[PDB]
Design a protein around this ligand. Sequence first.
Ligand SMILES: OC[C@H]1O[C@@H](O[C@H]2[C@@H](OC[C@H]3O[C@@H](O[C@H]4[C@H](O)[C@@H](O)[C@H](O)O[C@@H]4CO)[C@H](O)[C@@H](O)[C@@H]3O[C@@H]3O[C@H](CO[C@H]4OC[C@@H](O)[C@H](O)[C@H]4O)[C@@H](O[C@@H]4O[C@H](CO)[C@@H](O)[C@H](O)[C@H]4O)[C@H](O)[C@H]3O)OC[C@@H](O)[C@@H]2O)[C@H](O)[C@@H](O)[C@H]1O
Length: 359
Amino acid sequence: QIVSEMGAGWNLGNQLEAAVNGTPNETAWGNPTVTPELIKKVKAAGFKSIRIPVSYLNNIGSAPNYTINAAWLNRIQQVVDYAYNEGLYVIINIHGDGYNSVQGGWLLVNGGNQTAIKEKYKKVWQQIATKFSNYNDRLIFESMNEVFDGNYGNPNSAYYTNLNAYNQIFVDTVRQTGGNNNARWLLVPGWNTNIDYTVGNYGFTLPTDNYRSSAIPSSQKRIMISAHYYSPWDFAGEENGNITQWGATSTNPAKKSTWGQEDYLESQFKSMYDKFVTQGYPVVIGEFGSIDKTSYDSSNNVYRAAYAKAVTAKAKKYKMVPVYWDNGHNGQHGFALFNRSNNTVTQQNIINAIMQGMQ
Ligand SMILES: OC[C@H]1O[C@@H](O[C@H]2[C@@H](OC[C@H]3O[C@@H](O[C@H]4[C@H](O)[C@@H](O)[C@H](O)O[C@@H]4CO)[C@H](O)[C@@H](O)[C@@H]3O[C@@H]3O[C@H](CO[C@H]4OC[C@@H](O)[C@H](O)[C@H]4O)[C@@H](O[C@@H]4O[C@H](CO)[C@@H](O)[C@H](O)[C@H]4O)[C@H](O)[C@H]3O)OC[C@@H](O)[C@@H]2O)[C@H](O)[C@@H](O)[C@H]1O
Protein backbone atom coordinates (compact mmCIF):
# COMPACT_ATOMS: atom_id res chain seq x y z
CA GLN A 1 0.00 0.00 0.00
CA ILE A 2 0.94 3.66 -0.23
CA VAL A 3 0.02 3.73 3.49
CA SER A 4 2.51 1.04 4.63
CA GLU A 5 5.34 2.56 2.61
CA MET A 6 4.76 5.95 4.27
CA GLY A 7 5.07 4.46 7.77
CA ALA A 8 5.04 7.18 10.42
CA GLY A 9 5.36 10.86 9.53
CA TRP A 10 7.09 13.84 11.07
CA ASN A 11 6.25 17.55 10.51
CA LEU A 12 9.05 20.04 9.82
CA GLY A 13 6.92 22.54 11.73
CA ASN A 14 7.68 26.24 12.34
CA GLN A 15 10.07 26.50 9.35
CA LEU A 16 8.99 27.09 5.78
CA GLU A 17 5.48 28.16 6.97
CA ALA A 18 6.87 30.65 9.46
CA ALA A 19 6.24 34.24 8.44
CA VAL A 20 6.44 37.72 9.91
CA ASN A 21 4.62 40.75 8.57
CA GLY A 22 3.41 38.53 5.72
CA THR A 23 6.85 37.43 4.52
CA PRO A 24 7.87 33.72 4.86
CA ASN A 25 11.10 33.22 6.78
CA GLU A 26 12.17 29.80 8.07
CA THR A 27 14.14 31.28 11.03
CA ALA A 28 11.36 33.65 12.23
CA TRP A 29 9.76 31.24 14.68
CA GLY A 30 12.73 30.14 16.88
CA ASN A 31 14.21 27.41 14.68
CA PRO A 32 17.55 27.41 12.79
CA THR A 33 17.76 27.30 8.97
CA VAL A 34 16.88 23.72 7.94
CA THR A 35 19.93 21.56 7.04
CA PRO A 36 20.03 18.03 5.58
CA GLU A 37 21.48 16.55 8.81
CA LEU A 38 18.18 17.31 10.58
CA ILE A 39 16.20 15.25 8.06
CA LYS A 40 18.83 12.48 8.28
CA LYS A 41 18.32 12.41 12.08
CA VAL A 42 14.50 12.19 11.80
CA LYS A 43 14.86 9.30 9.33
CA ALA A 44 17.30 7.60 11.75
CA ALA A 45 14.64 7.91 14.47
CA GLY A 46 12.35 5.62 12.34
CA PHE A 47 10.22 8.18 10.43
CA LYS A 48 9.55 7.33 6.78
CA SER A 49 7.65 10.44 5.67
CA ILE A 50 8.19 14.13 6.29
CA ARG A 51 5.52 16.77 6.06
CA ILE A 52 6.73 20.21 5.06
CA PRO A 53 4.41 23.12 5.83
CA VAL A 54 5.15 25.96 3.35
CA SER A 55 3.75 29.50 3.33
CA TYR A 56 3.69 31.76 0.32
CA LEU A 57 1.97 35.02 1.34
CA ASN A 58 3.92 38.11 0.26
CA ASN A 59 6.39 36.00 -1.71
CA ILE A 60 3.57 35.91 -4.28
CA GLY A 61 3.84 38.78 -6.77
CA SER A 62 0.91 40.89 -7.98
CA ALA A 63 -1.98 40.03 -10.27
CA PRO A 64 -2.49 38.78 -12.93
CA ASN A 65 0.61 36.58 -12.79
CA TYR A 66 1.02 36.00 -9.06
CA THR A 67 4.69 35.08 -9.71
CA ILE A 68 6.32 33.42 -6.67
CA ASN A 69 9.79 34.73 -5.73
CA ALA A 70 12.24 32.50 -7.57
CA ALA A 71 14.50 32.39 -4.48
CA TRP A 72 11.55 31.11 -2.45
CA LEU A 73 10.77 28.23 -4.85
CA ASN A 74 14.47 27.45 -5.02
CA ARG A 75 14.61 27.31 -1.18
CA ILE A 76 11.57 25.07 -0.93
CA GLN A 77 13.07 22.79 -3.58
CA GLN A 78 16.38 22.52 -1.57
CA VAL A 79 14.43 21.57 1.59
CA VAL A 80 12.24 19.02 -0.26
CA ASP A 81 15.48 17.55 -1.73
CA TYR A 82 16.88 17.01 1.77
CA ALA A 83 13.98 14.60 2.35
CA TYR A 84 13.38 13.29 -1.14
CA ASN A 85 17.05 12.40 -1.73
CA GLU A 86 16.90 10.34 1.47
CA GLY A 87 14.23 8.04 -0.04
CA LEU A 88 11.45 9.48 2.14
CA TYR A 89 7.91 10.44 1.32
CA VAL A 90 7.45 14.18 1.29
CA ILE A 91 4.34 16.25 1.54
CA ILE A 92 4.30 19.93 0.56
CA ASN A 93 1.31 22.17 1.13
CA ILE A 94 0.00 25.72 1.25
CA HIS A 95 -0.02 26.45 5.02
CA GLY A 96 -0.19 30.05 6.44
CA ASP A 97 -1.99 31.39 3.31
CA GLY A 98 -5.30 29.69 4.20
CA TYR A 99 -5.59 31.32 7.67
CA ASN A 100 -7.64 34.36 8.59
CA SER A 101 -5.32 34.77 11.58
CA VAL A 102 -2.02 34.82 9.59
CA GLN A 103 -0.98 38.27 8.36
CA GLY A 104 -1.13 38.19 4.59
CA GLY A 105 -3.55 35.23 4.62
CA TRP A 106 -5.70 35.35 1.44
CA LEU A 107 -7.13 31.89 0.71
CA LEU A 108 -10.23 32.70 2.74
CA VAL A 109 -13.52 30.79 2.30
CA ASN A 110 -15.14 33.78 3.94
CA GLY A 111 -13.57 36.08 1.34
CA GLY A 112 -15.97 38.21 -0.71
CA ASN A 113 -13.73 38.03 -3.77
CA GLN A 114 -13.85 34.28 -4.49
CA THR A 115 -13.13 34.63 -8.23
CA ALA A 116 -9.94 36.51 -7.29
CA ILE A 117 -9.01 33.95 -4.60
CA LYS A 118 -9.48 31.04 -6.96
CA GLU A 119 -7.44 32.66 -9.74
CA LYS A 120 -4.51 33.36 -7.38
CA TYR A 121 -4.74 29.80 -5.98
CA LYS A 122 -4.73 28.27 -9.52
CA LYS A 123 -1.69 30.35 -10.60
CA VAL A 124 0.18 29.59 -7.36
CA TRP A 125 -0.39 25.83 -7.66
CA GLN A 126 0.55 25.99 -11.35
CA GLN A 127 4.00 27.35 -10.43
CA ILE A 128 4.56 24.94 -7.54
CA ALA A 129 3.43 22.02 -9.71
CA THR A 130 5.66 23.20 -12.62
CA LYS A 131 8.61 23.51 -10.21
CA PHE A 132 8.16 19.91 -8.94
CA SER A 133 7.00 18.20 -12.15
CA ASN A 134 9.94 15.75 -12.48
CA TYR A 135 9.68 14.42 -8.91
CA ASN A 136 8.14 10.96 -8.51
CA ASP A 137 5.29 9.48 -6.38
CA ARG A 138 7.27 9.97 -3.18
CA LEU A 139 6.43 13.69 -3.55
CA ILE A 140 2.81 14.41 -2.44
CA PHE A 141 0.99 17.75 -2.93
CA GLU A 142 -1.34 18.83 -0.21
CA SER A 143 -3.86 21.44 -1.47
CA MET A 144 -4.08 23.46 1.70
CA ASN A 145 -3.72 23.14 5.44
CA GLU A 146 -6.48 24.11 7.90
CA VAL A 147 -9.09 26.00 5.96
CA PHE A 148 -12.13 27.57 7.66
CA ASP A 149 -13.72 30.92 8.62
CA GLY A 150 -12.11 31.25 12.05
CA ASN A 151 -15.33 29.95 13.75
CA TYR A 152 -15.36 26.66 15.75
CA GLY A 153 -18.98 25.57 15.36
CA ASN A 154 -21.12 24.25 12.52
CA PRO A 155 -19.55 25.02 9.08
CA ASN A 156 -21.35 27.58 6.88
CA SER A 157 -22.50 25.65 3.79
CA ALA A 158 -21.64 28.43 1.31
CA TYR A 159 -18.14 28.58 2.80
CA TYR A 160 -17.73 24.79 2.58
CA THR A 161 -18.57 25.08 -1.12
CA ASN A 162 -15.66 27.54 -1.55
CA LEU A 163 -13.33 25.07 0.26
CA ASN A 164 -14.63 22.30 -2.03
CA ALA A 165 -13.95 24.57 -5.03
CA TYR A 166 -10.27 25.01 -3.97
CA ASN A 167 -9.79 21.28 -3.71
CA GLN A 168 -11.21 20.83 -7.24
CA ILE A 169 -9.10 23.68 -8.76
CA PHE A 170 -6.00 22.20 -7.05
CA VAL A 171 -6.59 18.73 -8.49
CA ASP A 172 -7.38 19.84 -12.10
CA THR A 173 -4.60 22.49 -12.10
CA VAL A 174 -1.95 20.00 -10.94
CA ARG A 175 -3.13 17.31 -13.39
CA GLN A 176 -2.87 19.71 -16.31
CA THR A 177 0.83 20.48 -15.67
CA GLY A 178 1.42 16.84 -16.75
CA GLY A 179 3.50 13.80 -15.62
CA ASN A 180 4.62 13.12 -13.02
CA ASN A 181 1.92 15.56 -11.90
CA ASN A 182 -0.78 13.76 -13.87
CA ALA A 183 -0.26 10.68 -11.69
CA ARG A 184 1.01 11.91 -8.36
CA TRP A 185 -0.92 11.49 -5.11
CA LEU A 186 -2.80 14.66 -4.12
CA LEU A 187 -3.85 15.22 -0.50
CA VAL A 188 -6.95 17.32 0.32
CA PRO A 189 -8.67 18.24 3.61
CA GLY A 190 -12.21 19.06 4.65
CA TRP A 191 -13.37 21.81 6.99
CA ASN A 192 -10.63 22.91 9.46
CA THR A 193 -9.08 19.44 8.92
CA ASN A 194 -11.84 18.36 11.33
CA ILE A 195 -12.91 14.66 11.19
CA ASP A 196 -16.53 15.30 12.22
CA TYR A 197 -17.03 18.07 9.73
CA THR A 198 -15.25 15.98 7.07
CA VAL A 199 -17.12 12.67 7.59
CA GLY A 200 -20.55 14.08 8.59
CA ASN A 201 -23.22 15.55 6.30
CA TYR A 202 -21.89 19.15 6.59
CA GLY A 203 -20.98 19.70 2.92
CA PHE A 204 -17.67 18.04 2.12
CA THR A 205 -17.44 16.74 -1.44
CA LEU A 206 -14.70 14.62 -2.98
CA PRO A 207 -12.94 16.29 -5.90
CA THR A 208 -13.24 14.61 -9.32
CA ASP A 209 -9.99 13.59 -11.09
CA ASN A 210 -11.14 14.04 -14.75
CA TYR A 211 -7.98 15.66 -16.12
CA ARG A 212 -5.90 12.71 -14.99
CA SER A 213 -5.29 10.33 -17.87
CA SER A 214 -8.21 12.04 -19.69
CA ALA A 215 -7.67 10.06 -22.91
CA ILE A 216 -7.25 6.68 -21.21
CA PRO A 217 -9.70 7.35 -18.35
CA SER A 218 -9.54 6.63 -14.65
CA SER A 219 -10.73 5.15 -12.46
CA GLN A 220 -8.35 4.17 -9.61
CA LYS A 221 -7.96 7.03 -7.14
CA ARG A 222 -4.77 9.08 -6.77
CA ILE A 223 -6.37 11.30 -4.13
CA MET A 224 -5.85 11.08 -0.32
CA ILE A 225 -7.88 12.75 2.43
CA SER A 226 -6.38 14.88 5.21
CA ALA A 227 -7.44 15.35 8.81
CA HIS A 228 -5.58 16.48 11.91
CA TYR A 229 -6.17 15.27 15.42
CA TYR A 230 -5.51 17.15 18.67
CA SER A 231 -8.45 15.92 20.77
CA PRO A 232 -8.92 16.36 23.69
CA TRP A 233 -7.82 19.98 23.42
CA ASP A 234 -7.70 20.27 27.23
CA PHE A 235 -4.81 17.79 27.38
CA ALA A 236 -3.22 18.25 23.92
CA GLY A 237 -3.31 22.06 23.34
CA GLU A 238 -4.56 24.20 26.22
CA GLU A 239 -1.61 26.25 27.47
CA ASN A 240 -2.03 25.80 31.21
CA GLY A 241 -1.60 23.20 33.89
CA ASN A 242 -5.27 22.34 34.44
CA ILE A 243 -5.12 19.11 32.43
CA THR A 244 -1.86 17.16 32.18
CA GLN A 245 -2.83 13.47 31.96
CA TRP A 246 -4.65 11.34 29.49
CA GLY A 247 -5.98 7.88 28.85
CA ALA A 248 -6.57 4.61 30.68
CA THR A 249 -3.28 4.49 32.59
CA SER A 250 -4.03 7.84 34.25
CA THR A 251 -5.81 7.49 37.58
CA ASN A 252 -5.65 11.14 38.65
CA PRO A 253 -9.10 12.79 38.19
CA ALA A 254 -7.93 16.22 39.28
CA LYS A 255 -5.52 16.29 36.27
CA LYS A 256 -6.96 13.89 33.73
CA SER A 257 -8.71 15.05 30.60
CA THR A 258 -12.48 15.20 30.74
CA TRP A 259 -13.09 13.79 27.25
CA GLY A 260 -11.55 12.40 24.04
CA GLN A 261 -10.22 9.21 25.62
CA GLU A 262 -9.56 5.84 23.98
CA ASP A 263 -13.22 5.22 23.09
CA TYR A 264 -13.50 8.61 21.37
CA LEU A 265 -10.25 8.09 19.44
CA GLU A 266 -11.54 4.74 18.16
CA SER A 267 -14.86 6.15 16.92
CA GLN A 268 -13.15 9.13 15.24
CA PHE A 269 -10.64 7.09 13.23
CA LYS A 270 -13.34 4.47 12.60
CA SER A 271 -15.43 7.15 10.86
CA MET A 272 -12.55 8.15 8.49
CA TYR A 273 -11.98 4.48 7.64
CA ASP A 274 -15.71 3.88 6.98
CA LYS A 275 -16.18 7.02 4.82
CA PHE A 276 -12.88 7.14 2.86
CA VAL A 277 -10.41 4.25 3.32
CA THR A 278 -13.08 1.73 2.26
CA GLN A 279 -13.75 3.85 -0.85
CA GLY A 280 -10.10 3.67 -2.01
CA TYR A 281 -8.96 7.05 -0.62
CA PRO A 282 -5.90 6.73 1.59
CA VAL A 283 -6.09 8.91 4.73
CA VAL A 284 -3.28 11.02 6.17
CA ILE A 285 -3.54 12.27 9.75
CA GLY A 286 -1.23 15.18 8.78
CA GLU A 287 -0.81 16.50 12.32
CA PHE A 288 -1.25 15.07 15.87
CA GLY A 289 0.56 15.62 19.17
CA SER A 290 0.37 17.11 22.65
CA ILE A 291 2.14 20.13 24.10
CA ASP A 292 4.84 19.85 26.80
CA LYS A 293 3.26 20.29 30.28
CA THR A 294 6.16 18.91 32.39
CA SER A 295 6.45 22.44 33.88
CA TYR A 296 3.09 21.76 35.59
CA ASP A 297 3.18 18.00 36.22
CA SER A 298 6.36 16.01 36.32
CA SER A 299 4.47 12.90 34.94
CA ASN A 300 3.27 14.62 31.69
CA ASN A 301 5.74 12.95 29.29
CA VAL A 302 4.36 9.57 30.31
CA TYR A 303 0.99 10.73 29.01
CA ARG A 304 2.41 12.51 25.95
CA ALA A 305 3.96 9.13 24.92
CA ALA A 306 0.71 7.26 25.75
CA TYR A 307 -1.31 9.71 23.67
CA ALA A 308 1.14 9.42 20.73
CA LYS A 309 1.19 5.61 21.01
CA ALA A 310 -2.60 5.40 20.96
CA VAL A 311 -3.01 7.83 18.08
CA THR A 312 -0.32 6.09 15.96
CA ALA A 313 -1.61 2.57 16.70
CA LYS A 314 -5.23 3.53 15.89
CA ALA A 315 -4.18 5.05 12.57
CA LYS A 316 -2.18 1.91 11.85
CA LYS A 317 -5.31 -0.16 12.61
CA TYR A 318 -7.49 1.89 10.22
CA LYS A 319 -4.89 2.08 7.41
CA MET A 320 -4.14 5.81 7.74
CA VAL A 321 -0.78 7.59 7.96
CA PRO A 322 -0.02 9.24 11.34
CA VAL A 323 2.20 12.34 11.02
CA TYR A 324 3.57 13.90 14.22
CA TRP A 325 3.42 17.71 14.75
CA ASP A 326 6.91 18.90 15.77
CA ASN A 327 7.32 22.66 15.93
CA GLY A 328 11.00 22.63 17.13
CA HIS A 329 10.12 24.24 20.45
CA ASN A 330 11.63 22.34 23.36
CA GLY A 331 10.16 24.14 26.36
CA GLN A 332 6.87 25.04 28.00
CA HIS A 333 3.99 23.99 25.72
CA GLY A 334 6.52 22.76 23.16
CA PHE A 335 5.92 19.92 20.73
CA ALA A 336 9.55 19.20 19.77
CA LEU A 337 11.07 15.69 19.80
CA PHE A 338 14.45 16.96 18.58
CA ASN A 339 16.73 19.87 19.41
CA ARG A 340 17.27 21.30 15.95
CA SER A 341 20.26 23.41 17.16
CA ASN A 342 22.34 20.46 18.29
CA ASN A 343 20.67 17.85 16.09
CA THR A 344 19.92 15.65 19.13
CA VAL A 345 16.87 13.72 20.35
CA THR A 346 14.99 15.40 23.19
CA GLN A 347 11.91 13.14 23.52
CA GLN A 348 13.10 9.56 23.02
CA ASN A 349 10.06 8.13 24.91
CA ILE A 350 7.60 9.81 22.54
CA ILE A 351 9.58 8.60 19.49
CA ASN A 352 9.52 5.15 21.14
CA ALA A 353 5.76 5.33 21.60
CA ILE A 354 5.31 6.23 17.87
CA MET A 355 7.51 3.34 16.71
CA GLN A 356 5.74 0.92 19.06
CA GLY A 357 2.40 2.18 17.64
CA MET A 358 3.64 1.50 14.09
CA GLN A 359 4.16 -2.21 14.80
O1 LIG B 1 1.40 36.28 11.00
C1 LIG B 1 1.55 35.11 11.76
C2 LIG B 1 0.58 35.20 12.94
O2 LIG B 1 0.28 33.91 13.43
C3 LIG B 1 -0.83 33.92 14.33
O3 LIG B 1 -1.20 32.61 14.78
C4 LIG B 1 -1.55 31.71 13.74
C5 LIG B 1 -0.38 30.80 13.41
O4 LIG B 1 0.11 30.13 14.61
C6 LIG B 1 1.49 29.82 14.55
C7 LIG B 1 1.71 28.61 15.45
O5 LIG B 1 1.54 27.39 14.74
C8 LIG B 1 1.54 26.27 15.59
O6 LIG B 1 1.40 25.03 14.90
C9 LIG B 1 0.07 24.87 14.46
C10 LIG B 1 0.07 24.49 12.96
O7 LIG B 1 0.52 25.57 12.18
C11 LIG B 1 -1.32 24.09 12.48
O8 LIG B 1 -1.27 23.59 11.16
C12 LIG B 1 -1.79 23.05 13.47
O9 LIG B 1 -2.94 22.36 13.05
O10 LIG B 1 -1.97 23.71 14.70
C13 LIG B 1 -0.67 23.79 15.27
C14 LIG B 1 -0.74 23.96 16.80
O11 LIG B 1 -1.33 25.21 17.16
C15 LIG B 1 2.88 26.15 16.29
O12 LIG B 1 2.92 25.05 17.16
C16 LIG B 1 3.16 27.41 17.08
O13 LIG B 1 4.42 27.17 17.66
C17 LIG B 1 3.07 28.64 16.16
O14 LIG B 1 3.07 29.79 16.98
C18 LIG B 1 4.14 30.68 16.73
O15 LIG B 1 5.24 30.28 17.49
C19 LIG B 1 6.39 31.05 17.25
C20 LIG B 1 7.53 30.48 18.08
O16 LIG B 1 7.26 30.61 19.45
C21 LIG B 1 7.76 29.55 20.29
O17 LIG B 1 9.09 29.29 20.09
C22 LIG B 1 9.97 30.40 20.32
C23 LIG B 1 9.78 30.95 21.75
O18 LIG B 1 10.49 32.16 21.95
C24 LIG B 1 8.30 31.19 22.00
O19 LIG B 1 8.11 31.69 23.30
C25 LIG B 1 7.54 29.89 21.76
O20 LIG B 1 6.19 30.09 22.10
C26 LIG B 1 6.13 32.56 17.47
O21 LIG B 1 7.23 33.24 16.92
C27 LIG B 1 7.74 34.26 17.78
O22 LIG B 1 7.04 35.47 17.62
C28 LIG B 1 7.35 36.33 18.70
C29 LIG B 1 6.24 37.36 18.85
O23 LIG B 1 5.76 37.73 17.57
C30 LIG B 1 8.73 36.90 18.38
O24 LIG B 1 9.15 37.76 19.43
C31 LIG B 1 9.77 35.77 18.16
O25 LIG B 1 10.86 36.25 17.39
C32 LIG B 1 9.22 34.49 17.49
O26 LIG B 1 9.92 33.35 17.94
C33 LIG B 1 4.84 33.01 16.74
O27 LIG B 1 4.50 34.34 17.04
C34 LIG B 1 3.70 32.10 17.10
O28 LIG B 1 2.52 32.47 16.40
O29 LIG B 1 -0.75 29.93 12.44
C35 LIG B 1 -1.72 28.98 12.88
C36 LIG B 1 -3.00 29.70 13.32
O30 LIG B 1 -3.82 28.85 14.07
C37 LIG B 1 -2.67 30.83 14.28
O31 LIG B 1 -3.85 31.54 14.56
C38 LIG B 1 -0.57 34.80 15.56
O32 LIG B 1 -1.78 34.97 16.28
C39 LIG B 1 -0.01 36.17 15.16
O33 LIG B 1 0.47 36.90 16.28
C40 LIG B 1 1.11 36.03 14.11
O34 LIG B 1 2.26 35.41 14.68
